[PDB]
């Protein structure tokens, strides 16, 4: 009697399964608007110049591949805290935060989930509906219940703040509430500063533990501005957790560079808690991969490389905003009667197109255009060369 | 009332806690025989030449960092299966095996444990007494019970084959039994081929699911020879799991390069099982880090680089063998009256020294010689320059 005989096949990942269909499609002119990769104006996914410079430096100067500590490169953790909280933050001066280098933002989310499930009485995590599909899997893998809160007004293409507030009414003291720090995935709709401040006050009154997922810092307005919501929470909370990723804003997707940051009331408490976070990492992958995080730490700690990187990040933010405008314009030019102007108000790589599952299927099967079944399209996959055919396809299924 | 306030500090890792103490130790003569790192004759922990050359190729030819698939680089998987099972194996031609690239051997162990606990009826894993200390933590954290079988005869410094087989008669069908492929950690004592064949037959009769941990392929006798015990299992079993590591045989510790290989009765079953292993990876770190695995796959797939690497591995293995001999001879010269000849018959980086916990504590506090509290010593940390002080210290505590 085989152990593997009773196993049920896993469903296809809603995002990665799509990219597998795309790689199999033999039809010429297929267009990939699925997975969240940054493409340049020629349809390629390049390595940043700042990253190549840093990798050259590492090649010439690394003398050993000796294991990192469980929590990773120390300079990486410190530069990360400055990015998130600000160079002179009280949180850093009071030594209230500890950061672990992790394998991507995904790995940072799993490390937090394992830590919470094993060392606290947290039973429940609240996630926006919609959210990144993998959020539920990560927290469920540690045995945590995941509930959903309302977020998106699909009528006005706006944040439904009233429904958000009402739907979080039953989130209890000691529940985790997950917020996207900026560039909400998939809607591209973020709270305003005043909405963030309102959420911060309510969180402290209700006793929630906030967990911020930061995968797109620098893609909305700028590095400092995109962190304003987080910093409004950090000014008011004793405790919070930040999972952050450098996959997107350094174009380091496949090197798995992220961080999990813990904040507690004081230095002694966060050190105690962090020692249990390190134990959860040790029972998982033991210590994190060095190459990607070394690149990031090299760039952030060298003024000249850092200035190259900040300009590269700006050029990527601006290309995406330009494509958002060109998309709306070309849809009108190609004859759409539906108003797509809301696309211009959305932030980051993704917008909710408002297409139905049926229309997304038609686009894939009839026109070779690949989006996620929720209607999320990757605007950063749009180029001046593929824009007209893409828009003709959409207009055809409207 | 903070969520983190009542968390208890985690105890130190028996291996990584020692490394921290050693780093902080201010004495210039300190000697590190704890963590399993390869040192060259001069006390350095070098990057291999094959690896530097492969990294230079990657630097100049890499055009993108786009995500690998969940299971990683395909050539890496194929080359791993060839090393494990042999260039013309029936497991491979029958398409009975699927491999996922993982963040180290540690990550491969957690992926297997998550996959087992979430998709099968397995409740119990059997691990040798003694074993690598992190084995229990990994399987306990996935929710599996850990049971110990007998292995080492401490009086005779030998494998107690009878005790082992008696202990394992309590293991039931559908339990997982974990075997070290070669260079048993910490004892350095491995089954002979005959004993492997005996366990393999006994394994099918009782219905165990074998799990091989293969972190030292090439450090006992040779690449092919060190897999004989696994290949005897593979010829008889419908199902098995191998977690393997390239940290040590490539000196790639901090890049986290390993693999989890699943074997099932046929191609249809292993694909069904592998789909759930991918789901378990997706909810952990999503996809594995590219740099380290790309280096390995570049080396194994290029005949000139492979030849360099295979010579560098031979040199490491022989250097360790020369140190085992030198250690025994120098102990007698420095006035030890115990017979340490058993060290010569142990394989790999580690010997079980027979020192007590109290003697190990003295070696550290009074002499700055760092060994694990079990008395395991890293022979690969021994050099001609530190042999005399190390042996004088040991004689002083007998
Ligand atoms: C909201 C959110 N969190 C986490 C991630 C995962 O990032 P990473 O590739 O660093 O694991 C993504 C993007 O993939 C994301 O959009
Ligand atoms: C038996 C055994 N399994 C697994 C590992 C973990 O290897 P890695 O560093 O690749 O995670 C080690 C040592 O590191 C080991 O000795």
Numbering used by the authors:
A (entry chain A), B (entry chain B): -1 to 396
What does the paper say about this structure?
E. coli aspartate aminotransferase (AAT) is a pyridoxal phosphate (PLP)-dependent enzyme that catalyses the reversible transamination of l-aspartate with α-ketoglutarate, yielding oxaloacetate and l-glutamate. During its catalytic cycle, AAT undergoes hinge movement to switch between an open conformation, in the ligand-free form, and a closed conformation upon association with substrates or inhibitors. Using our approach, we enrich the less populated but catalytically active closed conformation in order to increase catalytic efficiency (kcat/KM) with the non-native substrate l-phenylalanine, leading to altered substrate selectivity. Steady-state kinetics reveal kcat/KM increases of up to 100-fold towards this aromatic amino acid, resulting in a selectivity switch of up to 1900-fold, and structural analyses by room-temperature X-ray crystallography and multitemperature nuclear magnetic resonance (NMR) spectroscopy confirm that the conformational landscape is remodeled to favor the target state.
To determine if these differences in the temperature dependence of exchange could be observed in the crystal state, we also solved the maleate-free structures of WT, HEX, and VFIT at 303 K, and calculated isomorphous difference density maps by subtracting electron density at 278 K. By contrast, similar comparisons for WT and HEX showed relatively little difference density. We calculated ΔG at 278 K for HEX to be –1.72 kcal mol–1, a small difference that would be compatible with the interconversion between these two states to be part of the catalytic cycle.
